[PDB]
Amino acid sequence: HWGYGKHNGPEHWHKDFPIAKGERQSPVDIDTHTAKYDPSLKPLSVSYDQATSLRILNNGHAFNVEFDDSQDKAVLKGGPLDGTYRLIQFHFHWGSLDGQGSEHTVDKKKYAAELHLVHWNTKYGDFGKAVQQPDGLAVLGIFLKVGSAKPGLQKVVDVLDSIKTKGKSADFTNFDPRGLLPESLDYWTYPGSLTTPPLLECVTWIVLKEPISVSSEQVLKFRKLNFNGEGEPEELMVDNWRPAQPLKNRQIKASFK
Numbered sequence: 661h662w663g664y665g666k667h668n669g670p671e672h673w674h675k676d677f678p679i680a681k682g683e684r685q686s687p688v689d690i691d692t693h694t695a696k697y698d699p700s701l702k703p704l705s706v707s708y709d710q711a712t713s714l715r716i717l718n719n720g721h722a723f724n725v726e727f728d729d730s731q732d733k734a735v736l737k738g739g740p741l742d743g744t745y746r747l748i749q750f751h752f753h754w755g756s757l758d759g760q761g762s763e764h765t766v767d768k769k770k771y772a773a774e775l776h777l778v779h780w781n782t783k784y785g786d787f788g789k790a791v792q793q794p795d796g797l798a799v800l801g802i803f804l805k806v807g808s809a810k811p812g813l814q815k816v817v818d819v820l821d822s823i824k825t826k827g828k829s830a831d832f833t834n835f836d837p838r839g840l841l842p843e844s845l846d847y848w849t850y851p852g853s854l855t856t857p858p859l860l861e862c863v864t865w866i867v868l869k870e871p872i873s874v875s876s877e878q879v880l881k882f883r884k885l886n887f888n889g890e891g892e893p894e895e896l897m898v899d900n901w902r903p904a905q906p907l908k909n910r911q912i913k914a915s916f917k
């Protein structure tokens with residue numbers, strides 16, 4: 661099955677998921693000079709005060725921090741969005757080295773990692789129905805650079821030892837995702853897709869301009885995770901990013917001048 665290796669990585673995905681070569685695939689390079697400022701774009705509303713994290717899972721591709729999405733608790737609205745989108749999970753993509761790992765790029769710059777906070781449009785009732793719709797998901801993407809530690813990330817980092825291998829989970833309650841946000845909510849936005857199989861073209865992407873800083877030690881701990889299951893040959897969970905895809909007939913809009 662699909663993964664990030666030589667034999668099952670991004671350049672193979674199209675064989676099982678032909679939408680891989682579609683018209684609105686993600687990620688993309690954000691050409692900052694070509695992105696147009698859109699004065700009609702609203703400030704993003706990130707309302708995470710009542711967020712209820714439940715669990716952290718190593719799914720063999722990344723780790724997901726999962727949230728209770730059975731009520732309007734942690735929601736994303738405004739910005740380019742119409743209606744209310746509920747937080748279901750977050751995860752990261754990262755590299756084997758600090759010079760790569762992000763999925764989106766900014767004028768071809770790769771960041772060390774990229775955080776995806778995944779939300780679904782409440783008008784579709786559940787996540788599985790939402791992914792079948794062109795406006796079903798809103799993914800908030802946040803770049804990570806290596807520098808000072810992110811204190812709000814440390815709780816995540818410290819639990820990774822308990823979910824080293826594929827299919828392991830751990831209780832992960834009371835985690836506040838507000839601690840993963842940068843100061844500014846300036847963003848770029850464009851219509852795109854899931855960046856892993858099934859690659860569904862259901863996402864409004866909202867990518868923050870300002871990266872967060874994490875420490876070298878924090879990202880090193882991401883790189884100790886395993887793609888493999890327990891008692892299988894150790895394959896370090898690194899380079900779990902899809903490269904930039906063709907922009908085709910799309911415009912990237914900026915919320916800021």
Ligand SMILES: NS(=O)(=O)c1ccc(C(=O)N2CCc3cc(O)c(O)cc3C2)cc1
Binds near residue numbers: 749778799853854858
């Ligand atoms: N990298 S990204 O674009 O932010 C991204 C966001 C979300 C997901 C995701 O949670 N998935 C894929 C689609 C899917 C579809 C299902 O029907 C399902 O039950 C579960 C899932 C699980 C994967 C990737």
Ligand SMILES: [Zn+2]
Binds near residue numbers: 751752753776855
């Ligand atoms: Zn992702």
